[PDB]
Design a binder for this molecule. Structure first.
Ligand SMILES: *[C@@H]1O[C@H](CO)[C@@H](O[C@@H]2O[C@H](CO)[C@@H](O[C@@H]3O[C@H](CO[C@H]4O[C@H](CO[C@H]5O[C@H](CO)[C@@H](O)[C@H](O)[C@@H]5O)[C@@H](O)[C@H](O[C@H]5O[C@H](CO)[C@@H](O)[C@H](O)[C@@H]5O)[C@@H]4O)[C@@H](O)[C@H](O[C@H]4O[C@H](CO)[C@@H](O)[C@H](O)[C@@H]4O)[C@@H]3O)[C@H](O)[C@H]2NC(C)=O)[C@H](O)[C@H]1NC(C)=O
Ligand SMILES: *[C@@H]1O[C@H](CO)[C@@H](O[C@@H]2O[C@H](CO)[C@@H](O[C@@H]3O[C@H](CO[C@H]4O[C@H](CO[C@H]5O[C@H](CO)[C@@H](O)[C@H](O)[C@@H]5O)[C@@H](O)[C@H](O[C@H]5O[C@H](CO)[C@@H](O)[C@H](O)[C@@H]5O)[C@@H]4O)[C@@H](O)[C@H](O[C@H]4O[C@H](CO)[C@@H](O)[C@H](O)[C@@H]4O)[C@@H]3O)[C@H](O)[C@H]2NC(C)=O)[C@H](O)[C@H]1NC(C)=O
Ligand SMILES: *[C@H]1O[C@H](CO)[C@@H](O[C@@H]2O[C@H](CO)[C@@H](O[C@@H]3O[C@H](CO[C@H]4O[C@H](CO[C@H]5O[C@H](CO)[C@@H](O)[C@H](O)[C@@H]5O)[C@@H](O)[C@H](O[C@H]5O[C@H](CO)[C@@H](O)[C@H](O)[C@@H]5O)[C@@H]4O)[C@@H](O)[C@H](O[C@H]4O[C@H](CO)[C@@H](O)[C@H](O)[C@@H]4O)[C@@H]3O)[C@H](O)[C@H]2NC(C)=O)[C@H](O)[C@H]1NC(C)=O
Ligand SMILES: *[C@@H]1O[C@H](CO)[C@@H](O[C@@H]2O[C@H](CO)[C@@H](O[C@@H]3O[C@H](CO[C@H]4O[C@H](CO)[C@@H](O)[C@H](O[C@H]5O[C@H](CO)[C@@H](O)[C@H](O)[C@@H]5O)[C@@H]4O)[C@@H](O)[C@H](O[C@H]4O[C@H](CO)[C@@H](O)[C@H](O)[C@@H]4O)[C@@H]3O)[C@H](O)[C@H]2NC(C)=O)[C@H](O)[C@H]1NC(C)=O
Ligand SMILES: *[C@@H]1O[C@H](CO)[C@@H](O[C@@H]2O[C@H](CO)[C@@H](O[C@@H]3O[C@H](CO[C@H]4O[C@H](CO)[C@@H](O)[C@H](O[C@H]5O[C@H](CO)[C@@H](O)[C@H](O)[C@@H]5O)[C@@H]4O)[C@@H](O)[C@H](O[C@H]4O[C@H](CO)[C@@H](O)[C@H](O)[C@@H]4O)[C@@H]3O)[C@H](O)[C@H]2NC(C)=O)[C@H](O)[C@H]1NC(C)=O
Ligand SMILES: *[C@@H]1O[C@H](CO)[C@@H](O[C@@H]2O[C@H](CO)[C@@H](O[C@@H]3O[C@H](CO)[C@@H](O)[C@H](O[C@H]4O[C@H](CO)[C@@H](O)[C@H](O)[C@@H]4O)[C@@H]3O)[C@H](O)[C@H]2NC(C)=O)[C@H](O)[C@H]1NC(C)=O
Ligand SMILES: *[C@@H]1O[C@H](CO)[C@@H](O[C@@H]2O[C@H](CO)[C@@H](O[C@@H]3O[C@H](CO)[C@@H](O)[C@H](O[C@H]4O[C@H](CO)[C@@H](O)[C@H](O)[C@@H]4O)[C@@H]3O)[C@H](O)[C@H]2NC(C)=O)[C@H](O)[C@H]1NC(C)=O
Ligand SMILES: *[C@@H]1O[C@H](CO)[C@@H](O[C@@H]2O[C@H](CO)[C@@H](O[C@@H]3O[C@H](CO)[C@@H](O)[C@H](O)[C@@H]3O)[C@H](O)[C@H]2NC(C)=O)[C@H](O)[C@H]1NC(C)=O
Ligand SMILES: *[C@@H]1O[C@H](CO)[C@@H](O)[C@H](O)[C@H]1NC(C)=O
Length: 1171
C-alpha cells in the first residue's frame, strides 16, 4: 500500500482542519490557504500572500501612510477556524498588523477582510501557531457568534490585547467585526499587557499553543516569561480559563502546569488535545461518560521556547481534576488567604478578600479579588517519554472502549499508543510506529482525525499525509495480528486476513473472527510423516477454534496439489497426493521436505490453517547409519547397499537392516599404529559384514593420505573381522611425527562400510620431530619408537643395530634418565633479589618425571622450587625462585640436575640470570582527578624485572599497561580523598617504596562556559572554554554525538580555568543540520575518568550547516548560501580565502565573499575547505 499525500509545492504549511460534515480538509499556509478532498487531492487554492508591507507600521499602509520602507513580505497563516454556522472559514493572517480573512466554505470565495478599525488588527507577530482560539455561537437573533482569541504582542501593549472576547457579525462586509463583546471606558472584554511590566521585563510575551471549549468555558495552554521565574529568558507553561458568558472578563484563572518523570522536569507545552476516554480509561480513572480529558506534550526544563529540547513527555490531565484545582483555589481566596499572585498582570500585589459564598464549578468571577493567578503548579500523569526523538503533536480517540493516542515526532513519525494505566497492563504501551516525512520533517500540532475516524491527517512543514488509524492488513498471521495489540485488529479466520470487526464479513457469527491470541487457528495431522513412495494415504485432521465448515473444505499441501475432504465428528479426513504428484515436489530437496499443509475453505477459497507436514525420501541416505539410526522409518539393504522404505526392495530376506545395532559397521580396537616404510598387516574387527553376493567383488582398505592414497585389498574372515594385506605406507613432508589418517573400508568397488567411531590409522615416523632422547621417550609407549645411543637418533629396535645389549634405550615406564640435558633459553632474564619469580626454563633433553627434576633446579646457589602443573616433561620447567637476599653474587648461571647431579647429567644455562633491586624516582603527571583514569609514567631503574607487577596508589590498584627497563605505565584508580597518596610497587616478593615520590589527587574539573555556543557541520572552529582544575588533565578532548555517530577533537589547556578547543566534525551523509540550527544528541568532554563531564545536560550548544559555494585589478566575489549563521553576540566565522598559499584581506557578507586579487582558489573556515 501507499500513503495518500498532498505535497507543498512552493511554501511551508502552518495549519490544518477538517470539516465535520464533508471531510474536506482545509490547510493554512504561508501565502496560501488550500481546500482538499478527503484523499488529499487539491480542490481549491487561495492566494493570501506576498504582500507589500512592513511590521513597524501602525495602521498598515492601506489606511495611513507610513514613513518606514515597504517590501514584498510573506503573509503567514497564524490561525484557522471553521465557522459552520455561517458557512465559511476564518483564516487569520499576519503581515498587516494581523488582519483577518473570511473565506467561503465550499469555494474559498473571500466574503470579507475587515481592516479599517483598530480591532480589525490582531497582532504584528509574524510567528505561526503562537496564536489559538475557539469559535462559539448561538442561534440567529439571539446573542450572536463570538470569537475568543489569544495572541502574542511583541511589546505592542497598547495596540493589541493578548486575550480578547470579540464579536462575529453575519455580514463579512459589516464593519462591526472583531469588536469586543462589551466595551466600556472602565472595563472591556479584553486583557491587555501592562506597560509597567514591559518596562521591568523587556520582552515578556504570551504565546498561545492550544485552545478548546469545554462544557461552558474556554481553556488555553500558554507559555510566558521569567516573572519570579534584567537577566535571561525562562518560560512557564500554564493553563488559562474563562466563562463563555463573562463579558467583564472576571473569570480569568491561570495555573502553572507540567509533570515529572523520575526527578526530571517537563514544563514546556508543545501541543495538547481534549478528548474522551471511552469505557476503558474512564472506569479506572474514575469518570462519568461525558467527563473530558486532556492529553499533552511537554519538553524538558524551562529553556529555549524558540528551539526546545529533544527530551519530551506525554502527560495527562482529567478536567474534573483541573476543575477541582480551580474550585479549590477560589474557595481559598474567598477565605481571604494570601494574595492574588499574578506577576505580569498586577505588579503591586492586591490581597484576597474574604466573603461568604456558595463556591461552585458554575462560578463566573466577581468584582473584587478580580483576575487571579495560581500557586500550586498542577501536576500531570505521565504516559510515554521519548528521549532520542522529540514528540511534537498529539491526538486521541475512543475505539470500542480502548483509548488510542497519536503522537507526532521531530522525525516525521506517528506513534499509536494504547494508554493502559487504567487498563490491566503495567504502564501505557506503544503499539506501532509509522512514517510520513521520513527525511526528518517534524509533524505539526494540527493533527486531526477524519469525521468517519478512519484516517488521521498528519501535517508537516512541507506535506499533508493521510495516515490510516487502522491498517491491520500489514499483519500476515493470526499470531502476529493479535500480537500487535493495537485494538482495531482481529483475525478474520476464514478470509485469513487481519482487520476490524466491521470489515470482516459474518464476523458476528461463532468463531468466525478472533480477538484474543487463544482464539487463533490450531491444527494437527495424525500421519505427520508420509513417505515419498506411499500414495493416497488417509490422514485425519484435528482443528480447534474454527467456525462451521459444513460449507466444505479442501486440503492443499501447498500451491502444488489439492484433495477433497469429508467431515465426521470433530475431524477432517483427506488423502495424500499420488506418487505421480508427490515426487515433483521432493525432487532436489533430497533427505526430506517439510511442507505447509493448508486448509482451503469452500466459502472463502482462501487457505487459513496450517501444519508442518513431512515428506520423507529414504533413498537419498547413502549409509546404514543415516538410514536406520536417523529420525525416520527407513530400511537398509546390507547387500544392495541402498536405503529404502520397502522391505521387499532389499536384496533378500536376510539382508534387511531395521535396527541400528545390526548395521554393517567397523568396531574399534586399541589404536592402529602404522610406521612409515614398514611392511605391516592391519587386522580389524567389525560387525555384520556382508557376504558379497552374485556379481559382487571383495573388500579393500582405502587410506586417505593427502600425499598418497593407498588401495590395499583385504580378506573378510567372518561377519566380524577384516585385514588389509602386507604393505608399507608413507607421506611426503617429514613435518609431523604423528599423522592420523581417515580410512574407508570398501567392498565391490564403491560400497563404503559405515565408520561410526570414525576409526583412523596413525602413520608415525620415528622422529622427524624429535632429535633429543627426552622427546622420544616422551612420546607414546605404543609407537615402540625409542632412542638409540650410537646413531645419535631415534628409531625402533627394528631399525637400530645392537652393538651393545643395551644400545637401544626406551623409557620402560619413564624410569629412564636421559643423557646430556641442555638449556636453550629461559624467561625472565632478570629478577628481584627478594625472589618469588617464576622462572620459565626451556631445554631439550630433560627428565621424564617431575619428582626427579624437583630439587634439581638451582639459580647459582639459590634454591628454586619447580611447579607441577606448568611443567612440560623434558621440554620445559617452570620454577619458583626463593629468597636471594643473602647471595653475594649479582648474577648467576642456572643449573638443572636431572635426578642426580652426575657429571654427564647436568645442564648449565648459556647466558646467566640477573638479580636486581628495582627503584623509582619520578612520576610524569604527579597530579590527577579524584575519579582517576590518568596515564601515569613512573620512571626508575630495573623496572622490567621478575614476573608479576602490581602498582598501588593509596592501597587501591592501578590498571597496568606496559613495562620497561626505565618506565612503568599504568592507569590510575579512583581516589578516596583528595591530596597526597603513597605509591607502592610490588614485583613478586619484593615490595619497593618511596615516601619522597607521592601522587596528589585533585578535585574533579568542572565545565562552565563554551564561547561561541555553536559551530558548523565539519567543525574545526575555535571554542573558548572556561572551567576549573583544567591543568590536572594532560590531554582533554571534546566529544559530540550527532545521529548514530560519535566524534571527538583536541584541546589546548592554558590556565587552570581556560582552555581553547577545536570543534568536532559531525559530517554525516545521513543527516545535515538545518539553517535554523540543531542540538546534538550528546555534547561533553573526555577528561580521564570524570564521566559526569562526558554528557552535558544544561548545554544549549548548536550546530549549523557547512557553507554552500558556487564554482566557475578587479576584486574577487564568491557567492552562495549558508555563509553566516544567526548566532548570539558578535561571534562569526574566521574566513580565509587563499591563492596557492597567499591569504587575502577580505570583507565577509551573508551571501558573498569579497577577496582582493592582483590578476587554485581555496576557501577556509575552521575545519572547512572548498574550491
Ligand atoms: C528420492 O530421492 C532419490 C535419490 O536422491 C531421487 O531419485 C533420483 O532421481 C533422479 C531423476 O531426476 C536421478 O537423477 C538423474 O540420474 C540420471 C542417471 O542415473 C544413473 O546414475 C545414478 C547415480 O549413481 C550414483 O549413485 C550410486 C549409489 O549411491 C553410486 O554407487 C554411484 O557411484 C553414483 O554416484 C544411478 O543410481 C542410476 O541407476 C538407477 O536407475 C536404475 C533404473 O531405474 C535402477 O535399477 C537403479 O537401482 C538406480 O535407481 C543411473 O544409472 C542422469 O541422467 C541425470 O543426470 C543429468 O542431469 C543432471 C542435472 O540436470 C546433470 O548434472 C548431469 O550432468 C546429467 O545431465 C540425473 O542426475 C537419480 O539418479 C535418482 N537417484 C537414484 C539413487 O537413483 C528421487 O528424486 C526421489 N525418489 C522418488 C521416487 O521420487
Ligand atoms: C545413533 O543413535 C544412538 C542411539 O539413539 C545415538 O547414541 C548417542 O550416543 C551418545 C554417545 O556419544 C550418548 O551420549 C551419552 O549420554 C549418556 C547418558 O545417557 C542417558 O541420558 C541421555 C540424555 O538424557 C536427557 O535426554 C533424555 C531424552 O531427551 C531425557 O529423557 C532426560 O531427561 C535428559 O534430559 C538419554 O538420551 C539416554 O537415554 C537413551 O538410552 C535409553 C536406554 O537405551 C533409551 O531409553 C532412550 O531412548 C535413549 O536412547 C540416557 O538415559 C552419558 O552417560 C554418556 O557418557 C558416558 O558414557 C560413555 C560411554 O558409555 C563413557 O565413555 C563416558 O565416560 C560416560 O560415562 C554419553 O555422553 C547419547 O545419549 C546417545 N543418544 C541417544 C538419543 O540415545 C547416536 O548419537 C546416533 N549416532 C549417529 C552417528 O547417528
Ligand atoms: C590565563 O590565560 C588566559 C589567556 O591565555 C586569560 O584569558 C584572557 O586574559 C586576557 C588578559 O590576560 C584578556 O584579554 C584582554 O581583553 C581585554 C578586552 O576584553 C575584550 O576583548 C576580548 C578579546 O577579544 C578577542 O577574542 C574574541 C573572542 O574570542 C575575538 O572575537 C576577538 O577577535 C579578539 O581576538 C574578549 O574576549 C572580551 O570578551 C569577554 O568579556 C565579555 C563581557 O564581559 C564576556 O562575556 C566574554 O566571555 C569574554 O570573556 C572583551 O570583549 C583587553 O583590554 C586586554 O588588553 C590589555 O592587555 C594587553 C596585554 O596584556 C595590553 O597589551 C593592552 O594594552 C591592554 O591593557 C586583553 O586583550 C581576556 O579577556 C581573557 N579571556 C577571557 C575569555 O576571559 C586568563 O585571564 C589568564 N589568567 C590569569 C591572567 O591569571
Ligand atoms: C512420523 O509420523 C508419525 C505419525 O503417525 C509420528 O508417530 C507418532 O509419534 C509419537 C512420538 O513421536 C507417538 O506418541 C507416543 O505414543 C506413545 C504410546 O504409543 C502407543 O500408542 C500409539 C497410539 O495409540 C500406538 O501407535 C503405538 O503402537 C506403535 O508401536 C508398535 C510397536 O513398535 C508398532 O507395531 C505400531 O505400528 C505402532 O507404531 C503404541 O502402542 C506414548 O508412550 C508416548 O509418550 C511418551 O513420550 C513422552 C515424550 O517423551 C513422555 O512425556 C511420556 O511420558 C511417554 O514416555 C508418545 O505420546 C505416536 O503414538 C506416534 N503415532 C503413531 C500412529 O504411531 C512420528 O512422530 C513421526 N516421526 C517423526 C520422526 O517425527
Ligand atoms: C594537591 O592538589 C590540591 C589541588 O590542586 C592542592 O591545593 C591547591 O594548591 C594550589 C597551589 O598551587 C593552590 O593555588 C594557590 O592558592 C593560594 C591561596 O589558596 C587560597 O585561595 C584558593 C583560590 O582562591 C582557595 O581555593 C583556597 O581555599 C581552599 O582551602 C580551604 C581550606 O582548606 C577550603 O575550605 C576551600 O574549599 C578551598 O579548597 C585558599 O583559601 C595562593 O597563595 C597561590 O597564589 C599564588 O599564585 C598566584 C597566581 O599565579 C599569584 O598571584 C600569587 O602571588 C601567589 O604566588 C595559589 O593560587 C590552590 O588554591 C589549591 N587548590 C585546592 C582545590 O585546594 C594541594 O596543594 C596539593 N597537595 C600538595 C601536597 O601539593
Ligand atoms: C475519496 O475518499 C473516498 C473514501 O473516503 C474513496 O472512495 C471510496 O473508495 C472505496 C475503495 O477505495 C470504495 O469502497 C468500495 O465499496 C464497494 C461497494 O459499493 C465495494 O464493491 C468495493 O470493494 C472492492 O474493493 C475491495 C478492496 O479493494 C475488493 O476487496 C473488492 O474485490 C472490490 O473490488 C469497495 O469496498 C467506495 O466506493 C468509495 N467510498 C464511498 C463512500 O463511496 C476514494 O478513494 C477517494 N476519491 C477521490 C476522488 O479522491
Ligand atoms: C477441491 O478438490 C477437488 C477434488 O480434489 C477439486 O476438483 C478438481 O477440479 C478441477 C476443475 O477445477 C478438475 O480439473 C479438470 O480436469 C479436466 C480433465 O477431466 C482437465 O482437462 C481440466 O484442466 C484444464 O484446466 C486447468 C485449469 O484451468 C488447466 O491447468 C489445464 O491445462 C486444463 O486446460 C480441468 O481443470 C480436477 O479434475 C478436479 N480434481 C480431481 C482430483 O479430480 C477442486 O479443485 C476443489 N473443489 C473446489 C470446489 O474448489
Ligand atoms: C577426515 O574425516 C573427518 C571426520 O569425518 C572430516 O572432517 C569433518 O567431516 C565431517 C563429516 O562427518 C564434516 O561435518 C559436517 O558438518 C556440517 C555442519 O554444517 C553438517 O551439515 C554435515 O552433515 C557434516 O556433519 C566436517 O565439515 C569436516 N570438517 C571440516 C573441518 O571440514 C575430514 O574432512 C577428513 N579429513 C580429510 C583430510 O578429508
Ligand atoms: C606378512 O604377513 C604374513 C601373514 O600375516 C606373515 O606370515 C609374515 O610374517 C608377514 N611378512 C612380513 C615381512 O612382515
Amino acid at each position: 500500500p501507499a500513503f495518500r499525500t498532498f505535497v507543498a509545492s512552493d511554501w511551508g504549511l502552518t495549519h490544518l482542519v477538517v470539516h465535520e460534515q464533508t471531510g474536506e480538509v482545509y490547510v493554512g499556509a504561508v501565502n496560501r490557504i488550500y481546500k482538499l478532498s478527503g484523499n488529499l487531492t487539491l480542490l481549491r487554492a487561495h492566494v493570501t500572500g506576498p504582500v507589500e508591507d512592513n511590521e513597524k507600521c501602525y495602521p498598515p499602509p492601506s489606511v495611513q501612510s507610513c514613513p518606514h520602507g515597504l517590501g514584498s513580505t510573506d503573509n503567514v497563516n497564524k490561525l484557522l477556524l471553521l465557522d459552520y454556522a455561517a458557512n465559511r472559514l476564518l483564516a487569520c493572517g499576519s503581515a498587516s498588523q494581523g488582519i483577518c480573512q473570511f473565506l467561503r466554505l465550499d469555494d474559498l470565495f473571500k466574503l470579507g477582510e475587515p481592516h479599517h478599525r483598530k480591532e480589525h488588527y490582531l497582532s504584528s507577530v509574524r510567528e505561526a501557531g503562537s496564536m489559538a482560539g475557539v469559535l462559539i455561537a448561538g442561534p440567529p437573533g439571539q446573542g450572536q457568534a463570538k470569537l475568543f482569541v489569544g495572541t502574542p504582542i511583541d511589546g505592542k501593549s497598547e495596540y493589541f490585547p493578548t486575550l480578547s472576547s470579540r464579536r462575529l457579525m453575519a455580514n463579512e462586509e459589516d464593519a462591526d467585526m472583531f469588536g469586543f463583546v462589551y466595551q466600556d471606558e472602565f472595563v472591556s472584554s479584553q486583557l491587555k499587557i501592562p506597560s509597567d511590566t514591559l518596562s521591568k521585563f523587556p520582552a515578556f510575551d504570551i504565546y498561545y499553543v492550544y485552545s478548546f471549549r469545554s462544557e461552558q468555558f474556554v481553556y488555553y495552554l500558554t507559555l510566558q516569561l521569567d516573572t519570579q521565574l534584567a537577566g535571561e529568558h525562562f518560560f512557564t507553561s500554564k493553563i488559562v480559563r474563562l466563562c463563555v458568558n463573562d463579558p467583564k472578563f472576571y473569570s480569568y484563572v491561570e495555573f502553572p502546569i507540567g509533570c515529572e518523570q523520575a526527578g526530571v522536569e517537563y514544563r514546556l507545552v508543545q501541543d495538547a488535545y481534549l478528548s474522551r476516554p471511552g469505557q476503558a480509561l474512564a472506569k479506572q480513572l474514575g469518570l462519568a461518560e461525558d467527563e473530558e480529558v486532556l492529553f499533552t506534550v511537554f519538553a524538558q526544563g524551562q529553556k529555549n521556547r524558540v528551539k526546545p529540547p529533544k527530551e519530551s513527555a506525554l502527560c495527562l490531565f482529567t478536567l474534573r481534576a483541573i476543575k477541582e484545582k480551580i474550585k479549590e483555589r477560589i474557595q481559598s481566596c474567598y477565605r481571604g488567604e494570601g494574595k492574588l499572585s499574578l506577576p505580569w498582570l498586577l505588579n503591586k500585589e492586591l490581597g484576597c478578600i474574604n466573603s461568604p459564598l456558595q463556591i461552585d464549578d458554575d462560578f463566573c468571577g466577581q468584582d473584587f479579588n478580580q483576575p487571579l493567578g495560581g500557586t500550586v503548579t498542577i501536576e500531570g500523569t505521565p504516559l510515554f517519554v521519548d528521549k532520542e526523538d522529540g514528540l511534537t503533536a498529539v491526538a486521541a480517540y475512543d475505539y470500542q472502549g480502548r483509548t488510542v493516542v497519536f503522537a507526532g515526532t521531530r522525525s516525521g513519525r506517528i506513534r499509536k499508543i494504547l494508554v493502559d494505566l487504567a487498563n490491566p497492563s503495567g504502564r501505557p504501551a506503544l503499539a506501532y510506529e509509522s512514517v510520513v516525512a521520513q527525511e526528518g520533517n517534524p509533524i505539526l500540532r494540527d493533527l486531526v482525525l477524519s469525521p468517519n475516524r478512519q484516517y488521521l491527517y498528519a501535517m508537516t512543514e512541507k506535506q499533508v499525509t493521510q495516515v490510516p488509524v487502522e491498517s491491520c492488513v500489514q499483519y500476515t498471521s493470526c499470531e502476529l495480528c493479535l500480537g500487535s495489540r493495537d485494538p482495531h485488529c482481529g483475525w478474520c479466520v476464514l478470509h485469513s486476513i487481519c482487520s476490524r470487526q466491521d470489515a470482516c464479513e459474518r464476523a458476528e457469527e461463532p468463531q468466525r473472527f478472533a480477538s484474543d491470541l487463544l482464539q487463533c487457528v490450531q491444527l494437527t495431522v495424525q500421519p505427520r510423516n508420509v513417505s515419498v513412495t506411499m500414495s493416497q494415504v488417509p490422514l485425519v485432521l484435528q482443528a480447534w477454534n474454527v467456525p462451521d465448515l459444513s460449507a466444505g473444505v479442501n486440503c492443499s499441501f501447498e500451491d502444488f496439489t489439492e484433495t477433497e475432504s469429508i467431515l465426521e465428528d470433530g475431524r477432517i479426513h483427506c488423502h495424500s497426493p499420488s506418487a505421480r504428484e508427490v515426487a515433483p515436489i521432493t525432487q532436489g530437496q533430497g533427505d526430506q521436505r517439510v511442507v505447509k499443509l493448508y486448509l482451503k475453505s469452500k466459502e472463502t477459497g482462501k487457505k487459513f490453517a496450517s501444519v508442518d507436514f513431512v515428506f520423507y525420501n529414504c533413498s537419498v541416505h547413502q549409509s546404514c547409519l543415516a538410514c536406520v539410526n536417523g529420525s525416520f522409518p527407513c530400511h537398509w539393504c546390507k547387500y544392495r547397499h541402498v536405503c529404502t522404505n520397502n522391505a521387499a526392495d532389499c536384496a533378500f530376506l536376510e539382508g534387511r537392516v531395521n535396527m541400528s545395532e545390526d548395521c554393517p559397521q567397523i568396531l574399534p580396537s586399541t589404536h592402529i599404529y602404522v610406521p612409515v616404510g614398514v611392511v605391516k598387516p592391519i587386522t580389524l574387527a567389525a560387525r555384520n559384514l556382508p557376504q558379497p553376493q552374485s556379481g559382487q567383488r571383495g573388500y579393500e582398505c582405502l587410506f586417505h593420505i593427502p600425499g598418497s592414497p593407498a588401495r590395499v585389498t583385504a580378506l573378510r574372515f567372518n561377519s566380524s573381522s577384516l585385514q588389509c594385506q602386507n604393505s608399507s605406507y608413507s607421506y611426503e613432508g617429514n613435518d609431523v611425527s604423528d599423522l592420523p589418517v581417515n580410512l574407508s573400508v570398501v567392498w565391490n568397488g564403491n560400497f563404503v562400510i559405515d565408520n561410526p567411531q570414525n576409526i583412523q590409522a596413525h602413520l608415525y615416523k620415528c622422529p622427524a620431530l624429535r632429535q633429543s632422547c627426552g622427546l622420544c621417550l616422551k612420546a607414546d609407549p605404543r609407537f615402540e619408537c625409542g632412542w638409540c645411543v650410537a646413531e645419535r637418533r631415534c628409531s625402533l629396535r627394528h631399525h637400530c643395530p645392537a652393538d651393545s645389549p643395551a644400545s637401544w634405550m626406551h623409557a620402560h615406564h619413564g624410569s629412564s634418565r636421559c643423557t646430556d640435558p641442555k638449556i636453550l633459553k629461559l624467561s625472565p632474564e632478570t629478577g628481584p633479589r627478594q625472589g618469588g619469580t617464576r622462572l620459565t626454563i626451556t631445554g631439550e633433553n630433560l627428565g621424564l618425571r617431575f619428582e626427579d627434576v624437583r630439587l634439581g633446579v638451582h639459580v647459582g646457589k639459590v634454591l628454586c622450587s619447580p611447579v607441577e602443573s606448568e611443567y612440560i616433561s623434558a621440554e620445559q620447567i617452570v620454577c619458583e625462585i626463593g629468597d636471594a637476599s643473602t647471595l653475594r653474587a649479582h648474577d648467576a648461571l642456572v643449573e638443572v640436575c636431572v635426578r642426580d647431579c652426575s657429571l654427564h647429567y647436568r645442564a648449565l644455562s648459556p647466558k646467566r640470570f640477573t638479580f636486581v633491586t628495582p627503584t623509582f624516582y619520578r612520576v610524569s603527571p604527579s597530579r590527577g582527578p579524584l575519579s582517576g583514569g590518568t596515564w601515569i609514567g613512573i620512571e626508575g631503574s630495573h623496572l622490567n624485572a621478575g614476573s608479576d607487577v602490581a602498582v598501588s596508589i593509596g592501597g587501591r590498584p592501578c590498571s597496568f599497561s606496559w613495562r620497561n627497563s626505565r618506565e612503568i605505565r599504568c592507569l590510575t584508580p579512583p581516589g578516596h580523598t583528595p591530596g597526597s597518596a603513597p605509591i607502592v610497587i610490588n614485583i613478586n616478593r619484593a615490595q619497593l617504596s618511596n615516601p619522597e615520590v607521592k601522587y596528589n589527587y585533585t578535585e574533579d574539573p568542572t565545565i562552565l562556559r563554551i564561547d561561541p555556543e555553536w559551530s558548523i557541520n565539519s567543525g574545526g572552529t575555535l571554542l573558548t572554554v572556561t572551567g576549573t582544575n583544567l591543568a590536572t588533565v594532560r590531554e582533554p578532548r571534546i566529544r559530540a554525538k550527532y545521529g548514530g555517530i560519535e566524534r571527538e577533537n583536541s584541546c589546548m589547556v592554558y590556565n587552570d580555568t581556560t582552555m581553547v578547543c577545536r570543534a568536532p566534525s559531525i559530517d554525516n551523509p545521513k543527516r545535515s543540520p538545518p539553517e535554523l540550527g540543531e542540538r546534538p544528541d550528546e555534547i561533553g568532554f573526555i577528561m580521564d575518568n570524570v564521566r559526569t563531564l562526558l554528557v552535558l545536560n544544561s548545554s544549549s550548544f548548536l550546530y549549523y550547516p557547512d557553507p554552500v559555494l558556487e564554482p566557475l585589478s578587479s576584486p574577487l566575489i564568491l557567492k552562495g548560501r549558508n555563509l553566516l549563521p544567526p548566532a548570539p553576540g558578535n561571534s562569526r566565522l574566521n574566513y580565509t580565502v587563499l591563492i596557492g598559499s597567499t591569504p587575502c584581506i577580505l570583507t565577509v557578507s551573508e551571501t558573498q565573499l569579497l577577496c582582493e586579487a592582483p590578476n587554485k582558489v581555496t576557501v577556509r573556515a575552521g575545519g572547512f575547505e572548498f574550491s
